[PDB]
Design an enzyme around this catalytic site. Structure first.
Site, PDB file in Angstrom:
ATOM      1  N   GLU A   1       0.880  -1.260   0.247  1.00  0.00           N
ATOM      2  CA  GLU A   1      -0.069  -0.169   0.173  1.00  0.00           C
ATOM      3  C   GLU A   1       0.922   1.315   0.199  1.00  0.00           C
ATOM      4  OE1 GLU A   1      -3.245  -0.557  -0.206  1.00  0.00           O
ATOM      5  OE2 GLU A   1      -2.884  -2.092   0.294  1.00  0.00           O
TER       6      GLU A   1
ATOM      7  N   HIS B   1      -4.696   2.831   3.023  1.00  0.00           N
ATOM      8  CA  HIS B   1      -4.641   1.542   3.188  1.00  0.00           C
ATOM      9  C   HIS B   1      -3.048   1.317   4.393  1.00  0.00           C
ATOM     10  CE1 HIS B   1      -7.069   1.355  -0.818  1.00  0.00           C
ATOM     11  NE2 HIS B   1      -8.224   1.281   0.096  1.00  0.00           N
TER      12      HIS B   1
ATOM     13  N   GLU C   1     -11.010  -0.115  -4.481  1.00  0.00           N
ATOM     14  CA  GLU C   1      -9.895  -0.934  -5.266  1.00  0.00           C
ATOM     15  C   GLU C   1     -10.785  -0.943  -6.796  1.00  0.00           C
ATOM     16  OE1 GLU C   1      -6.888  -1.391  -5.407  1.00  0.00           O
ATOM     17  OE2 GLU C   1      -7.024  -2.740  -3.273  1.00  0.00           O
TER      18      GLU C   1
ATOM     19  N   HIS D   1      -9.730   2.319  -8.738  1.00  0.00           N
ATOM     20  CA  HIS D   1      -7.740   1.724  -8.824  1.00  0.00           C
ATOM     21  C   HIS D   1      -7.717   1.129  -9.959  1.00  0.00           C
ATOM     22  CE1 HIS D   1      -6.662   2.406  -4.205  1.00  0.00           C
ATOM     23  NE2 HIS D   1      -7.872   3.137  -4.961  1.00  0.00           N
TER      24      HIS D   1
ATOM     25  N   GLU E   1      -3.961   5.041  -1.251  1.00  0.00           N
ATOM     26  CA  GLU E   1      -2.783   4.374  -0.668  1.00  0.00           C
ATOM     27  C   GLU E   1      -2.405   4.700   0.428  1.00  0.00           C
ATOM     28  OE1 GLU E   1      -3.491   1.218  -4.002  1.00  0.00           O
ATOM     29  OE2 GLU E   1      -3.253   1.579  -2.046  1.00  0.00           O
TER      30      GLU E   1
ATOM     31  N   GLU F   1      -3.382  -5.007  -8.625  1.00  0.00           N
ATOM     32  CA  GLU F   1      -4.319  -4.819  -8.032  1.00  0.00           C
ATOM     33  C   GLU F   1      -5.909  -5.851  -9.002  1.00  0.00           C
ATOM     34  OE1 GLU F   1      -4.120  -0.769  -6.517  1.00  0.00           O
ATOM     35  OE2 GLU F   1      -4.722  -0.919  -8.060  1.00  0.00           O
TER      36      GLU F   1
HETATM   37 FE   LIG Z   1      -5.241  -0.583  -4.616  1.00  0.00          FE
HETATM   38 FE   LIG Z   2      -4.299  -0.230  -1.827  1.00  0.00          FE
END
Ligand SMILES: [Fe+3]
Ligand SMILES: [Fe+3]
Ligand SMILES: [Ca+2]
Ligand SMILES: [Ca+2]
Ligand SMILES: [Ca+2]
Ligand SMILES: [Xe]
Ligand SMILES: [Xe]
Ligand SMILES: [Xe]
Ligand SMILES: [Xe]
Ligand SMILES: [Xe]
Lengths: 72, 167, 510, 388, 388
Positions: free
Chosen positions: C97, C130, C226, C229, C127, C192
């Site tokens: 992350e 995270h 997510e 991303h 991120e 990811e």
């Molecule tokens: Fe991500």
């Molecule tokens: Fe992440």
């Protein structure tokens, strides 16, 4: 001199007792046998803004638990 | 004593650089160290476990001296040697665009890093170079990446095959 | 005079024009591709709305953690093997992350269309969220768990073992070192889309089956971010679809990206899942297939076809190397148990029955071996035995892939057993597959990472552990353990007496 | 089903029994403090510090790192994932910094969220209370739409100047701070547009298009020197430290503070405009928040580093002088805006005391920290010369 | 102990197995919606409505009641706990009202909380940014300290006028709205002092004691009629609907709005005061939020009631004329303050136009909803009489 400054509930509450002023009709609208002291103090020094802040923090944990983990 | 973070050998280099007291001197030792201990083309892997840390200590010495030596404008546009940083960059780039193959481009880039890595060249020019040089090097390599079979590629790279095993 | 306001969409409609053309408006990082300057983003967010939608997710997550869960004593009523397993899953994921932040920062510098820039920027902040979320899990389990050591210092103790180096390769260096686009693929299009998104949810599953309600509370929140991303990864291939150079490099950067990622998660994830738990959820061979072959390789990669994206060429190869990959690695991981920052356990009778049923022939190989080790005393500190000695006695050297950093033992492996060794200007290099060998031959200066044997050469085992604070609060007992029981835990002296000295297995070819 | 098909180890009696049976009598370690090995900046370790410090995998070769060995994968050419080679500055440890506000992700979004919600509520009240009636038509259509609206690109440019930093910062503490500075910058930029969008909604003749304010920014004359400065700090600077330092402890601290607190924050109230200040109060609150970080990083950590105190200040002072120039060119060019204002808005006596307020503040908070000998009387003089 | 001694049925294997054993196959009713029987005001029943409507145990003999019978215990003499006798207004159902902002307790404290925290960050930046430097000394020490301050006692009085309503309101939804209207008032009064407290901390010599403001309120000429009106609205009205209606639909809609918006909010900026407007924004946001609730209760529910529409409008029309006069008198006295200001601050025309703004809004937002025939020029004329 230019240090970040603010004011908290207790500093404001300091002058709350003086918010009330005298006038002939300043009296309770409800029947009673007793007379409540004009200078009675309260234990906790809160103001609306701060009262909302402490109750909202408690709300967060509660509903957060209820809506998320407990539900799952 | 022996150690991953603290060891006799690393102490031997702190005292060694601790004796440095001239920008020209400390600067030359760095340029050499980078030739003798870093990159796949290094002169020896004898310091593989400590060189990265020792280099930093060396750069530290060159950096401070270069500050007490260079005047405003210089510290910004000169290399620890006196050469015009801008000249060098623009010169190395011209060569990169002037490369027949990836094998040539790769040498220019790698050599450049060994010679002008800060405190030598000003970071501003170095990274701008690292921006232009990397681009071209990649463009040449990544072109038909899987064509050359492994046997052939090993020859091209000039590696000594010590052992191959495959069921 | 009616109440009026403005939302994110109304402001965002003009975000694309915040950028102005000028002589030096271009990326500062090397690249082969050209990100279009009229590329658009899927989600219309502004800094303030982003903050709000994210603070709402936090209220839920932290409220449960501090109140109900703590009241139920959730951080303790978990299975021992899982408590340990989370020390790794959470901290290793944390580094992923963290670099993801720098990765998207490098991407926001690459895009030219202000909207695309605003897309990566949103991930830069997610991120960061995270990193602090995985951090909290470790933090929470140390404060309220059955065994804090590890959860409390993974950030420094993880540097003792070899499973760490490989993680940095996929979730650290793979995310930030190379052509911006190559990094984008390693992180978004592959990392990811194919691994974390599915894993995050799977982790909550296994965690739940093993009594851990803490992890699902945090990872389920992480999950909600997510999809944006992934949309970034998709929009990345769109912003370079037209550049002529793309048709020349895209596919090879993706193949290299795909191989880099599965090369570590294939053996590691399955290992943590099946051997780091008590109650199982689903055989890893089945899972791997759905994730890699069907979901990613088939569907997710099929949508990028119109942009000129081909299925990875090393895909079938990955599938053949995968079957026994995770079982082969636990032997190496358990045999090197003293180098970790967590306690490992051997398969119990119910688990062995489970493995043989799911992986026919598992027992005749791995089972007989663990039982041999156990009778000889690998769990008892007074035995004077650690599985590494068994590898040496039976002449089964363990190598470290110079590229992927993944430990492999070609002599004992039931899966891949290929090995290529080379010498170049005074240094030797060991490889485990045809793909990583190419990467090194082609980009030798990109992979110069020292392996543990090289670093620990000639050093005595107990001293390396001591030097790197691999101990518990009493400075005597080891963090890592060969079993998860509560008594008879190994100490630094129990290790010292073995007198084990690391050696460089490649020098045997001398 | 009402009971669901999934069995959870925390509630399933059978699975819970196996779990409880395997548990130790007591925890296996009394030390239950995550990050206990971190050196605390304050009395006792904080969540901010525990959740943040050492998340970044730096090896001992990058001042302060705890890992060992080279990176596992580097750039084509050998460029390291992170290195000392990305900045001219040097330190004993890149993990020394500490945002005085101790902002990790959670508190940062909690705050910006409360602000968003209050901003929404404030707009719904302003429009309901018809306060727009008291605002001068010229100041509106002209100075807010064109001049204040153009200033969004200056803020948007500073936002983008952070991009590289977001990639090269040598530690987690520094990376988070940088991230939040730039993020707050883009926030202000989108707010300047938000105000224009709102006016388009309550004033029938207002056009929200960025054409007018952008044209003024791109080919105008008042912001000309300011735009050149921005383009340079953003795209001509590859040193992440020279960027954060120059943009926050020089350009924005001087030019920026002036355009926000000495021109608009000061004159908008005189044209019956409490709208624009509602937003400027946010920009200023953010400015004052960032300053505390910039100060701890470049002054408490680098500028006064037990080992590189001199080297850094020298480099910084050097940097200061390098940009103090294009920054003064930005301010001088700006003065040409006071000639646009209606006769009697403000005299030369005022816009002189304000310039001194700006410069004097810049000196006590930034310049004297690295001993950069600044002259207040010469700077004001240089700037004023632009008054048309 | 690591596990504790208390056994919880949710996690304890033995106890949990017992519970699961007694569980029915599925829910014994599929109607899983509390409040399902409440008449929705909008598309779908809301959380606000569900958690609120019918919490008050009224019987059918109080319009809309769902219970039956007398109260169990009444006052000495026989006065019911709650009854139709506490107000002249009549309705088909007291539970009709709906706060358009659907505010139950949770949302309410959340919003004020956000405001409280942003207020702290704003003050910290305003002080750290040194904006107080540009504020006029006379305006600050004379108009803010004395006159704005004195206005706190006004907002404080209107707060107390709600004390009887909290006890007598005939329904949960009205009680909650009533509670929140009064709570927003004391908040504002305290916010006024908070500002004086602040100034005391950043300006040496500024005494924050309430002595001066209080003397102005209780003995000055400027606020004489205002006080007389507030004293009567609070203690001379025993009808809780007259109290809420007259306070929010007449007095605070004319006098209150004028003082806050056409005087302090309008002039403050002209003195470099961006501090006072900051809080005044909160006060107006609150004013506008209360307006929607007040209009729903008095106009939408009571004033337009299918059975007592005409009766109610006659009553509210009666109250309007009763309090309009004291409100006009309050404005007349207040006009005397303009004389206290520095020369050329404002003129008879700006003041007149600003007076027509308050009256027109009041006529449009309130007067017209009950067919009250207000003459705008005549009201403004009566007030200007107080101009010295
Ligand atoms: Fe991500
Ligand atoms: Fe992440
Ligand atoms: Ca193979
Ligand atoms: Ca009078
Ligand atoms: Ca006039
Ligand atoms: Xe992992
Ligand atoms: Xe896992
Ligand atoms: Xe080992
Ligand atoms: Xe070893
Ligand atoms: Xe972080």
């Amino acid at each position: 001199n230019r240090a970040p400054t603010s004011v908290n509930a207790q500093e404001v509450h300091r002058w709350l007792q003086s918010f009330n002023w005298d006038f002939k009709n300043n009296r309770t609208k409800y029947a009673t046998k007793y007379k409540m002291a004009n200078e009675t103090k309260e234990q906790f020094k809160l103001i609306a803004k701060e009262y909302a802040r402490m109750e909202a923090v408690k709300d967060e944990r509660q509903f957060g638990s209820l809506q998320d983990a407990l539900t799952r | 004593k022996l150690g991953i973070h603290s060891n006799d050998t690393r102490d031997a280099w702190v005292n060694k650089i601790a004796q440095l007291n001239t920008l020209e001197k400390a600067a030359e030792m760095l340029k050499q160290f980078r030739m003798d201990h870093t990159t796949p083309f290094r002169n020896s892997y004898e310091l593989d476990n400590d060189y990265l840390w020792i280099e930093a200590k060396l750069e530290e010495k060159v950096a401070v001296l270069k500050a007490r030596a260079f005047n405003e404008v210089d510290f910004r546009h000169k290399t620890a040697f006196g050469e015009d940083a801008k000249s060098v960059l623009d010169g190395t780039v011209a060569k990169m665009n002037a490369a027949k193959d990836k094998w040539e481009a790769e040498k220019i880039h790698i050599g450049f890093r060994q010679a002008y890595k800060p405190p030598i060249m000003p970071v501003n020019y170095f990274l701008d170079g690292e921006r232009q040089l990397g681009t071209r090097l990649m463009e040449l390599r990544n072109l038909n990446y899987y064509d050359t079979p492994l046997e052939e590629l090993r020859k091209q790279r000039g590696v000594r095959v010590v052992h191959l095993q495959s069921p | 005079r009616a109440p009026t306001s403005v939302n994110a969409q109304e402001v965002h409609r003009w975000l694309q024009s915040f950028n102005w053309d000028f002589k030096n408006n271009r990326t500062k990082y090397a690249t082969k591709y050209k990100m279009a300057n009229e590329t658009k983003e899927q989600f219309k967010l502004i800094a303030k709305e982003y903050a709000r939608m994210e603070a709402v997710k936090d209220e839920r997550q932290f409220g449960s953690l501090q109140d109900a869960l703590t009241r139920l004593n959730a951080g303790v009523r978990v299975h021992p093997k899982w408590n340990e397993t989370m020390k790794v899953v959470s901290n290793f994921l944390e580094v992923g992350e963290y670099n993801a932040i720098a990765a998207t920062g490098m991407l926001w510098d690459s895009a030219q269309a202000a909207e695309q820039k605003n897309g990566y920027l949103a991930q830069v902040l997610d991120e960061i969220r995270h990193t602090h979320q995985c951090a909290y899990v470790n933090y929470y389990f140390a404060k309220n768990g059955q065994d804090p050591a590890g959860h409390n210092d993974a950030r420094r103790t993880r540097t003792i073992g070899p499973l760490w180096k490989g993680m940095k390769r996929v979730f650290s260096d793979g995310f930030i070192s190379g052509d911006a686009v190559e990094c984008s693929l390693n992180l978004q299009l592959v990392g990811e889309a194919c691994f974390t998104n599915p894993l995050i949810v799977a982790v909550t599953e296994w965690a739940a089956a093993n009594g851990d309600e803490i992890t699902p509370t945090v990872f389920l929140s992480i999950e909600t971010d997510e999809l944006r991303h992934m949309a970034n990864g998709y929009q990345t291939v769109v912003s370079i679809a037209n550049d002529p150079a793309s048709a020349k490099y895209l596919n090879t950067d993706l193949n290299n990206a795909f191989w880099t990622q599965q090369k570590y998660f294939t053996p590691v994830l399955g290992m943590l899942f099946e051997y780091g738990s008590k109650f199982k959820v689903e055989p890893w061979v089945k899972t791997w297939d759905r994730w890699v072959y069907e979901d990613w390789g088939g569907i997710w990669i099929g949508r990028l076809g119109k942009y000129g994206v081909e299925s990875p060429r090393s895909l079938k190869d990955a599938k053949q190397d995968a079957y026994w990959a995770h079982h082969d690695l636990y032997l190496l991981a358990y045999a090197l148990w003293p180098t970790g920052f967590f306690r490992l356990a051997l398969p119990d009778q119910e688990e062995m029955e489970w493995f043989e049923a799911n992986y026919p022939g598992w027992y005749d190989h791995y089972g007989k071996i663990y039982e041999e080790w156990r009778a000889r005393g690998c769990e008892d500190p007074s035995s004077g035995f650690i599985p590494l000695m068994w590898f040496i006695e039976n002449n089964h050297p363990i190598y470290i892939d110079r590229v992927s950093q993944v430990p492999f033992c070609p002599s004992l492996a039931k899966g891949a057993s290929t090995l290529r060794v080379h010498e170049y200007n005074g240094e030797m290099h060991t490889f485990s597959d045809q793909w990583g060998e190419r990467m090194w031959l082609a980009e030798p200066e990109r992979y110069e990472c020292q392996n543990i044997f090289e670093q620990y050469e000639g050093r005595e085992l107990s001293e390396v552990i001591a030097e790197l604070h691999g101990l518990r609060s009493d400075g005597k007992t080891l963090i890592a353990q060969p079993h998860v029981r509560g008594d008879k835990l190994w100490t630094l002296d129990d290790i010292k007496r073995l007198n084990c000295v690391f050696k460089n297995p490649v020098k045997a070819f001398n | 089903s009402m009971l669901g098909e999934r069995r959870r180890g925390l509630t399933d009696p059978e699975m819970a029994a196996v779990i409880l049976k395997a548990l130790p009598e007591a925890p296996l370690d009394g030390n239950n403090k995550m990050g206990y090995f971190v050196t605390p900046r304050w009395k006792r370790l904080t969540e901010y510090e525990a959740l943040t410090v050492y998340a970044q995998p730096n090896a001992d070769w990058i001042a302060g790192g705890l890992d060992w060995g080279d990176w596992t994968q580097k750039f084509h050419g050998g460029r390291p994932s992170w290195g000392n080679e990305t900045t001219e500055l040097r330190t004993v440890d890149w993990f020394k910094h500490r945002d005085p506000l101790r902002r990790w992700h959670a508190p940062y979004v909690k705050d910006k969220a409360e602000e968003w919600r209050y901003t929404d509520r404030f707009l719904q009240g302003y429009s309901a209370d018809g306060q727009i009636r008291a605002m001068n038509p010229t100041w509106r259509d002209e100075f807010i739409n064109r001049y204040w609206g153009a200033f969004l690109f200056n803020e948007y440019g500073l936002f983008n100047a952070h991009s590289q930093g977001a990639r090269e910062a040598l530690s987690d503490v520094t990376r988070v701070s940088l991230a939040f500075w730039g993020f707050d910058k883009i926030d202000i930029a989108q707010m300047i547009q938000l105000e224009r969008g709102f006016l388009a909604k309550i004033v029938p003749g207002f056009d929200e298009s960025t054409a007018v304010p952008k044209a003024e920014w791109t080919n105008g004359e008042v912001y000309k020197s300011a735009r050149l400065a921005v383009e340079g700090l953003w795209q001509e600077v590859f040193d992440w430290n020279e960027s954060a330092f120059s943009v926050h402890a020089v350009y924005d601290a001087l030019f920026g503070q002036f355009v926000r607190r000495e021109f608009f924050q000061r004159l908008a109230p005189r044209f019956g405009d409490n709208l624009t200040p509602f937003f400027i109060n946010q920009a200023q609150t953010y400015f004052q928040i960032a300053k505390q970080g910039v100060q701890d990083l470049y002054y408490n950590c680098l500028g006064d580093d037990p080992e590189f105190s001199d080297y850094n200040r020298t480099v910084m002072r050097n940097w200061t002088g390098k940009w103090l120039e294009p920054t003064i060119a930005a301010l001088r060019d700006f003065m040409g805006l006071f000639a646009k204002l209606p006769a009697g808005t403000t005299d030369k006596e005022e816009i002189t005391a304000s310039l001194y307020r700006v410069v004097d503040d810049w000196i006590e908070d930034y310049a004297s920290r690295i001993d950069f000998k600044a002259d207040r009387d010469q700077i004001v003089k240089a700037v004023l010369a632009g008054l048309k």
